[PDB]
Amino acid sequence: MMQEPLTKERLISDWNSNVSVAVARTTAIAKSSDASLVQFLAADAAATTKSTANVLKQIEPLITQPAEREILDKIMQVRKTYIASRDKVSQLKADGMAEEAESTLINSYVPAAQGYLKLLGELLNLQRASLDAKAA
Amino acid sequence: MQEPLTKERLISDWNSNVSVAVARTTAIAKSSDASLVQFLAADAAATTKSTANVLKQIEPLITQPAEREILDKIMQVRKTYIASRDKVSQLKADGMAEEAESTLINSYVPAAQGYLKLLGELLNLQRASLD
């Protein structure tokens, strides 16, 4: 059974929210012809990725059992791809290279974001099941 | 324990939806390109339908006078919020680019902030039950 499942569930809820926010923001950036939009959203984007960095600092020590450790390792590998593609979409759009940004969005960012959210859901499912198994 | 836990989970989904909509609406307002209104419209409709579904799910689970008071206030604030959200997109579609930005700042964001504050208050009632 997962230990401290409720604490991890709350941290993953915030993490999921941050990913969902960043996906909405990056998608809007990629599809707008306004190259300056990435600059006008940059402080908000920095706040969202910092919030996840903080979640990671809190949650990593609490992820202990093999099933949740295996998922966390998978999340960290996909997150590397996700961050590289997010930053590339943003740089291309800032640089006026709109077609390349749109191509990167679909070819790289979207699959990485979808995998990131799917793995976060697998991680959450482990926690929720453990908590629901002790609730009574 | 199960009832406040289910409500906490629903409120966390609701909070995510509002947070996503605030980011999306902010991008629509600040983009000089008004085409985001149409290209993001189905994603925005899905985020707001998701919240409509959470509202239907959580209603039968409301048990306490303070929950009901907060939910009633959320319904009022959500009306103000939805009108302003929709107005940002209508202004962008109508070519009123500067007014879309000013309406974001002076109407949509304050309503969203009050909406999130109330969701936090509703969430804290569940945390109190779980502690």
Numbering used by the authors:
A (entry chain A): 57 to 192
B (entry chain B): 58 to 188
Sentences from the study reporting this entry:
Bacterial chemoreceptors sense extracellular stimuli and drive bacteria toward a beneficial environment or away from harm. Typical chemoreceptor proteins, such as the well-studied E. coli chemoreceptors Tar and Tsr, consist of three primary domains: a periplasmic ligand-binding domain (LBD), transmembrane helices (TMs), and a cytoplasmic signaling domain (SD). MCP2201 from Comamonas testosteroni CNB-1 binds different di- and tricarboxylates, which are represented by TCA intermediates. Citrate and L-malate have been found to be the chemoattractant and chemorepellent of MCP2201, respectively.
To further elucidate the mechanism underlying D-malate’s role as a chemotactic repellent, we determined the crystal structure of D-malate-bound MCP2201 LBD at a resolution of 1.5 Å. Consistent with previous reports, the structure of D-malate-bound MCP2201 LBD shared the same four-helix bundle (α1: Q59-K87, α2: A91-L118, α3: P122-A150, and α4: A154-E193) with the L-malate-bound structure, with root-mean-square deviations (r.m.s.d) of 0.43 Å, and D-malate occupied the same binding position as L-malate and citrate. The pocket was formed by all four helices. More precisely, residues Y138 and R142 interacted with the 1′-carboxyl group, residue T108 interacted with the 2′-hydroxyl group, and residues R135 and Y172 interacted with the 4′-carboxyl group. The malate enantiomers in the two structures appeared in mirror symmetry. The structure indicated a D-malate-bound MCP2201 LBD dimer in the crystal. In the analytical ultracentrifugation assays, the D-malate-bound MCP2201 LBD predominately occurred as a dimer, the same as the L-malate-bound LBD. The dimeric interface of D-malate-bound MCP2201 LBD consists of α1 and α4 helices. Hydrophobic interactions are contributed by residues L62, V77, A80, A84, and L187 from both subunits, while hydrogen bonds are formed by residues E65, R66, S88, S89, D90, and D188 at the interface. Taken together, D-malate triggers a similar dimeric oligomerization to L-malate.
